[PDB]
Design a protein around this nucleic acid. Structure first.
Lengths: 50, 149
DNA sequence: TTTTCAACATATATTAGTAATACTTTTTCTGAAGATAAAATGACTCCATGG
DNA sequence: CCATGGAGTCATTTTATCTTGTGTCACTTACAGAAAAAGTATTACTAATATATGTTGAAAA
């Protein structure tokens, strides 16, 4: 049990699940920023990687 | 008919138009014979074709007759100025002021400036510095200046 | 076709003079528990008229 | 003249409030925009220079 899943997953696995999943979700929440002027402009986030 | 009801509905406007108090209820008061969506299809288009207008007051919404002078004026105005300009002349006497146009148009002060200056070259609006403190430069029609001092 | 030339040109910087315009800046310039109190509660009483 | 009604003052609760809470080391790390002023970038000129730059194209392999 402890050989496979290390003694500290608690800080490890949550940090992994972060850097893989949530980062992809955070920009998936805000991928669009356009201030109000020049109705043709936009900046679209798509991918996150570390 | 677009052109027929255009010109005869412009005829009730150019004759009287039920003044400024005219609302859409007065349409049925004179000619209600048209079906609802039809007379409103041509109301919508004549406002798009700038042969009629709409004023925002009280109940319902007001309409009025409009000729090509101010019609080609506003159609010549930008999409920015489009609602801006006609909204400015709504005061017509006391004028209106900078930031109180910003909230109503839901624009910045960034853009509302350049369209104002555009209207300054246009000279359909004039800079007015009134009784209250000169931080203002309220803007009324370049033609008319009824005011309190 | 590809490569080297060339070649054409055009900025690039100085120093001027204008002159005029336009354009950015800057610089004003304002539109946890147990005392303390406050008030609602209420009884007391002065003081009103009337049979 | 006297019981009454009405109010004025005066105890009395219950709500809104604020000061505290064992000791010592040993590290730790004023809003924003408006107007006025100052000054400047083009905007042409030669006029020499010598790179860069682009293109192109012509010329050669």
């Amino acid at each position: 049990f402890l050989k496979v899943k290390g003694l500290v997953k608690q800080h490890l696995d949550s940090f992994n699940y972060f850097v893989d999943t949530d980062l992809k979700k955070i920009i998936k929440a805000n991928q669009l920023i356009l201030s109000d002027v020049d109705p043709e402009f936009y900046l679209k986030y798509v991918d996150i990687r570390v | 008919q677009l052109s027929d009801n255009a010109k005869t509905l412009h005829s009730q406007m150019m004759s009287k138009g039920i003044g400024a108090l005219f609302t859409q209820q007065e349409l049925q008061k004179q000619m209600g014979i048209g079906s609802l969506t039809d007379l409103m299809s041509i109301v919508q288009e004549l406002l798009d074709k700038n042969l009629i207008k709409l004023v925002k007051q009280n109940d319902e919404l007001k309409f009025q007759g409009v000729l090509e002078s101010e019609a080609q004026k506003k159609a010549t105005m930008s999409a920015e100025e489009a609602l801006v300009y006609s909204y400015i002349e709504a005061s017509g006497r006391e004028g209106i002021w900078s930031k109180t146009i910003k909230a109503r148009t839901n624009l910045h002060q960034h853009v509302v400036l350049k369209c104002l200056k555009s209207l300054e070259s246009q000279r359909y609006v004039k800079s007015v510095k009134s009784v209250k403190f000169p931080t203002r430069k309220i803007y009324m029609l370049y033609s008319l200046q009824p005011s309190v001092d």
